[PDB]
């Protein structure tokens, strides 16, 4: 059907205490109920967790989990993966119980970022209330989007578009020097990927990161929610990556800020919806309409 | 096309007089014109009957009738049934006249609840007016939904989803003890089934009942209609199964009450509509958002 | 302009720990700052407090507070009290500071019920977030309504309608023998008054109560918020006074429960709004369309 | 404020069994409770009765009842009757109890047509459910309209517009020779009055009728409700007075039929609503856009 | 209430056959019934006539007719004319019969322009169907607007605004030397007046015209109706005065053409509507946003 | 009627080249025609100028200009100034020609702040097109708002509310010790006034400024227009006074920056609109919901 949205992200961390206070006091997410080691479960809506943090010696991406509509929809991904020759494994009894899904397959892309593709998640039904009064925009758009590293842009395009069936939604070139090529280069390509109306749920920057993550975006309903988060971040001396601005691409009004795992979170609103029957995949030539001053890091 | 909705229910009863007064004074349905033995015909809209009660020595389900769009739509069900090897029979001349349909096939599932699958019903056109002023919600959603018993959940899923072509809309686990397994069990699964936008028209609880029915739901337009029915039920000392509440699943605002056939009726409003192009089949972990206190039986 | 809405309610209480637990875990209101020791401010929205609970020896109503649009709307109420000769005091500096208003007058109706009419309240701006996810319905409808006790319904009709300017919105007759009177001769009236679109902000029953108060109604956005409350209340063993129902007059979908003060709170949604330009004052002949079984049950 | 709408109509009748059968099986109204023996209460909505039928020796109109918003709206009507010197009586205790109102004044217009102006009516709250599935259109438009007979149209214009405050909404001229007058010299006027958005609540024809009444109009929601009525009426052999049509002035889609009192009822839908702030009083020159063939036919 | 709109225009004409042909084949109006011999009634809607053309020796305006809501709205205009001492006559019986109104007063403004203020017009109810498929825009906006000639703009301002109660809606200055005055010293003003939401019903130019009239504007629903008219007019060799354009003040999309009377008709759509509660009277400094090239061309 | 909105602002300036560059390249306003040598007209819409900048020796406010609906709305303001004995002069012929208005009166409030109240302004009709693609929000809300300096807040309250008729829309208390007063005893008030739906057109701070002006606010349609401005301002090295935020009182999403006059301009969107019939004048206790960090930073 087929992948349909970003379901969860599992990350590994060296500072579980900082994650807990950043997730609860800056992001205004809600902590989920146990939660093994722990192991922090961060909640946005009726999913048992969207952001799962497990303790370890590295600050990195473990898995990205991707929701399908049903059993048939997972089978479609299986059939595609076999057609290409991508090795994949069924979740073990213990993995299904842990993620709380009916079926799941595990595999990596050629970079290899690890993927979990699943169907039949459990939901928790008590209202999830942020103490700051914002609601996240999830539903049919899913969790948010993730921008990850790739070792090779053309190879990512192949895997995500041709093998897995994402749609190419947007493309932006990088000057050859920024990816270590001679100024004489081939530019390289940052490509954005859609699986549902959310402009993108996924993108591949062909430059390295230590975590494997460039940014995670989560969306709230209103500008005020973004603005109030900015103030909570500033008050807690969270480092800023980009100033408030509006994207050209997805029309998201957002700021970026460093998380305790070293990568950025984009916290935004007003994200653009895409119909695949109308959409023309083209190249954008700027990141923002205004704002998003990425020089603010240093 | 293919099954499209719940058309009617035929039940057998030991107390025809209690049915008549419950159907007319509590449910505010209208009695249809003859009506063999009798045989009570209960009406909700322009169908000649939705709930047909025939006298006998048991309080049980006889058949569930399922409407298709047309001749081609019934043929599609025939072709599916032959593909699996399910024996089925054409209605006799006398059966077609009795149900008042153009074509119908008779068969049972592996449990075997008996099914009638038909097209080309007659309608009656005089306004059907409840003396209590409510209107039932039928139309493209059909009669309502029925929760029946199954001897085996996985076998029901097969028959209904893979053979007949219902969509899996929702799934809820039962602890192993409640179905007679050791506390060490496999949980068993209550699975909800859709054939049109009505969240579900059918569900299978894998625990026995004497009638074969767990509940029949009928929907009215407004909360007030539900509330007024509650008061009519209480006044007539109808026993309650669950208190007013809201479902997690289908978002139905409803109460359950025992009928004269021993099974419950859920009388509700505000039921959720589902688009199969968007819908993610997931597992719910609670029955209600609030209310629906099922301890009220004893 | 006139009085425009119900602003706040100040009550006295014998169990402060029970009110805090109630206010917070059943009602889902939010604690304000920084009431006197150990008074309790309970918030619904950007009012510094809508329900103020102060320690004492009775469970009783102290004052109902009534909001005016501005200084001139308050003057119009002085002028009306003067025409009648109704005594009123201007608030003291400490009272203004305490209530967080710019002006305020105090008086009592003829049954001794105490009013504070004010304008120019401070507001607090950080979002009030119920742990339970509901939002209250206030704004131009104000905090809700209050049903108080009265000694004489004809004297109250005159004070509230003719002197103060509320509009009579509905009336319901009560049997002469359950007021203490014969079985021939005049009924007693429950009268519902409004000062804004909320069908009623005020009603008066001529029947005696220990606290001064027959009920406080607070309104939430949706049926789900009412059902989730009822469920918290049942879990916390709160005594029920009336089952869920829908009223005939204001079409409120609500249930009633006993508070730590032993008066009811009505917790409801879907309240009907009234335009004075077309509204006909009539007599209702039932409490409910359906439910609201007071048998469960007090009083 | 003023009179705001038509409340009820009380008629006298020679055949009570025929009116009950009519009221119930043709009109699809609902029987109320518990009229005097063997009076008939016919209900459209939550009014205890809108058409009250009492046993007698004639088929005639007894009183038209006119609803005011509240006590002060009734006082405004006293004050207007006093300015003119129009005699009126206050209702007795038994009359108040009988009509289920809080106050009521009785008088007559100069042709002797009797009015009851009231406020504070009781309502009944259990759903009124027509066996035929239609809903009537009442609310702020009230029960409907009535076309009565008048002796002098200029005296009626003054009483109804100038003394009582209805607005003139439309006028239609009638030939001088079908009033009894020459063939040179002045026409007689049919004048349509309103007191709310319903294009008219009241009209007066200067032409004689046995009953006092030219017609009663009641309004249902949709065309289908009108067509289904017409069909019940044809099945019950009710005498038709005018075929289905659409009026020019109120754009009512309606037919006319004879009642057991021998006056017409107009049964219609799609009535036009009027805002007094922009409404121009003019003269219509036809009854209908189409249909309404009175040839079928009375009178 | 006051004058509420422009009702009708009566003009005198030297060529009756040309006006009928124009009225009917260019304007797409419909012939009314049964004007005097051989006067011409031209209809836009249910008014018996909106443009009445009578045989004579000049092409001139006879009277502008102005509609009031009712008898009391007409009295308010008498009262205003009396305060000023402006002479007016009541209409005669034959005049009432002729104009098909219930009351009417005649007077002239200080430049001698003749007004008929009326209420209680007859309407005709069979559908007025333009052979060309357009509908005119009238209703509460009335027949359209008229730009007349004035001797003194300050005297007209006083008569129309202060005595009669139109609102000043816009003003446009005219060069002192094209009024006949020096080159130092005061401009002359074109003033636009309204009595309903139509941006203007009346304007006055202090510049001389043979007919009394600078222009008549009539409004149709859509741009297509304007373009189809222009095309009939070009086919019939009607002299153009101004090409299609959009006005700055009323945002009318219109063209101007010469009539058989030699004054212009403006034929337009999309006229802007005004609410007096927020409308600011200002000065425009151009006729058009675009087009309306009067060079084509008269005058 | 009264004053209806803020019309224009006239300021004096020491650097004219800096204001032109600012006005044009940061604000995205459009240059008007043909101001005196070398005065600067800055346009937002069809007003000939909304911000008029004239060469001088200080950066100061000269006059705020206030628009009335018509001649009679201006008379109502004369009448109010007369009741108080407030001196005002009628404008001279050259002043009328210069301001492009029909009438105008000049006076000063009791702190010496100079007002020009006018009606009958000329408009210019060719589209005003910002090079940056934004549209300003003016119309019935007028040019924006201005926060001026005051010597006494109680005297200003009386002048602006009681004499001139603005409505008090909000109030915010300021610490007694940052006005120069003790630490016991009375706060000073920031008061926000409005004359139309724009939450405020005018506010007064009792704190000293070199220019007369605390800030000018101008409003654009959307958040994107604000963000694109901020970006032009950062590129042009304009000094920031307050970061982007949302106000508590008018829900304006805006940032503040220093102008070439050294007073702030607030550049914002999403301003809340007020209906006087339901608006309650209250006290706010924060500047912002979020952002608006004045630390960045002046003053
Ligand atoms: C460039 C861009 C376009 C559209 C988006 O929705 C979006 O998130 C981005 C940013 C992706 C990416 C990032 O987050 C880290 C810093 C990067 C490499 C840049 O400086 C340009 C693109 C940036
Ligand atoms: C559990 C549930 C979820 C969603 C629904 O729409 C719905 O009707 C139900 C109830 C089904 C079922 C029942 O009616 C009898 C008592 C049962 C076994 C329970 O106590 C839980 C589920 C119940
Ligand atoms: C009748 C009624 C209508 C609308 C309301 O909002 C509302 O609170 C009521 C109830 C009034 C009153 C009460 O508060 C306590 C118990 C009373 C006396 C009853 O037993 C019936 C009316 C009740
Ligand atoms: C003309 C008319 C317009 C609107 C109405 O609602 C309406 O009832 C009428 C009819 C008035 C009147 C009547 O009732 C009996 C028969 C009459 C006299 C006719 O023959 C024409 C007008 C009719
Ligand atoms: C300027 C104007 C605005 C709105 C209108 O509806 C409208 O008719 C006009 C035109 C007024 C006037 C005219 O009728 C004849 C020729 C005139 C004098 C011109 O040449 C410019 C203004 C014109
Ligand atoms: C508080 C406020 C609310 C709504 C407004 O539109 C608005 O401009 C303000 C700001 C008022 C005022 C100012 O202009 C300069 C700096 C001030 C004194 C502050 O530091 C807080 C309030 C500010
Ligand atoms: Fe992003
Ligand atoms: Fe159910
Ligand atoms: Fe209540
Ligand atoms: Fe009628
Ligand atoms: Fe014109
Ligand atoms: Fe501001």
Residue numbers in the entry:
A (entry chain B), B (entry chain B): 1 to 298
C (entry chain A), D (entry chain A), E (entry chain A), F (entry chain A): 1 to 299
Give me lines lifted from the publication on this model.
This pathway includes an iron-dependent extradiol dioxygenase, HsaC, that cleaves catechols. The active site is located within the central cavity of the slightly larger C-terminal domain, with the catalytically essential mononuclear Fe2+ ligated by His145, His215 and Glu266.
Briefly, the proximal hydroxyl (O4) of the catecholic ring binds the Fe in the site trans to His145 and the distal hydroxyl (O3) binds trans to His215, displacing the two water molecules in the resting state enzyme. In molecule B, the catecholic ring is bound to the iron in a monodentate manner via the 4-hydroxyl (proximal) group with an O4-Fe distance of 2.8 Å. In contrast to the different binding modes of the catecholic ring in the two molecules, the bicycloalkanone moiety of the bound DHSA occupies strikingly similar conformations in the two complexes, suggesting that this moiety is a major determinant in the binding of the substrate. More precisely, the bicycloalkanone moiety occupies a largely hydrophobic portion of the substrate-binding site, contacting Leu174, Leu190, Leu205, Val 214, and Phe294.
